[PDB]
Design a protein around this ligand. Structure first.
Ligand SMILES: [Cl-]
Ligand SMILES: [Cl-]
Lengths: 110, 115, 110, 115
């Protein structure tokens, strides 16, 4: 669960310190239909950000996307994600030698 | 200018080779690049890139003229209809080159910004 | 590289001991064309095997497949894999509280 | 026998619910199951399963009658044309049920083995 997320994060980023951040914005519907494609957008204001990655640690492929960027480009990513079940969207930004994390739950109906 | 084009064209070839390997590339209308037609001298230019190439797993963005040509690279699981936004400062007029990797093949589109 | 593989393996299996094993068979062509789909088959004779998983640690999704099985069913998996560049196929079997690993390189041309 | 069928049918429903959630399921000819028509009493039966349902990411195999119905579960990245082989001992005649998950939908096929 948490171990898996951390393992996934580590493979992307190595062993860098992680801390929660509100300087990462995640937009997704609060609740979603089983099987529906759902719009998800992620962004960050962290000046030195050189990567923003999206994890869905409950899924077979825990990393959904990875956006490498030069610093100061305020990257945003938008995609459509199929919602199987109530899950957490976990977003991580690297800026320098620090990792920043934000988490958002999407509830799924049946 | 011609020689400056020749220079940045060679730099771009190397970078695409450095990123994807020495793979053949084709031009595509299935890559969407939005940016201002014109922009302010030395300011931030909003850029948006998407693609409708089926099993697209990478979108890489190149700015040939600049010291490091590859400005961004987006890896994704296929069929998530990705759109990637970024802002980039631009000291002068230049082409934005997008290469998308899908299947075992590279797809390219280019858009100019005047400045 | 190695850290990534181990991180990927850990997310699947947890922190179990891993050891190389020749009781895992991997069939793939020695050399492959850039971009080609290539037949790959994996199997194991390890009696207590309850999982066989296939990793491609160089790729964006390091885990390609995972076959959960009851013990004594001698699982085999066969699939078609797109070969981008010279890479290692890494296969791991869980049997009891032990992890078993076998590695095979597929060279790619250009 | 009817009641024994009713029993194992209920067990199967629960297991598919336990594995995939309470999702609707349809029957499919796009699932290929190979096994002997007949087999020896209490011996190993070779089984092969594949599917051609496009974005198939899981193949799960159920043996309803037995104490634990779900016998195997195959997670895979899509479009790798997976075929999964296993041998299973069978004490008596029984149905093999395969459920494939693709997109946000479940697909089912069944094959009988006499023994
Ligand atoms: Cl929605
Ligand atoms: Cl081959």
């Amino acid at each position: 669960s948490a171990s898996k997320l951390d393992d996934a994060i580590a493979a992307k980023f190595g062993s860098l310190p992680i801390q929660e951040s509100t300087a990462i914005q995640i937009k997704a519907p609060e609740i979603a239909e089983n099987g529906a494609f759902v719009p998800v957008t992620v962004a960050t204001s962290i000046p030195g950000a050189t990567n923003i990655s999206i994890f869905t640690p409950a899924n077979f492929s825990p990393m959904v996307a990875s956006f490498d960027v030069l610093p100061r480009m305020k990257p945003e990513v938008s995609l459509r994600m199929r919602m199987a079940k109530t899950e957490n969207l976990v977003v991580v930004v690297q800026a320098g030698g620090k990792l920043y994390r934000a988490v958002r739950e999407v509830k799924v109906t049946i």
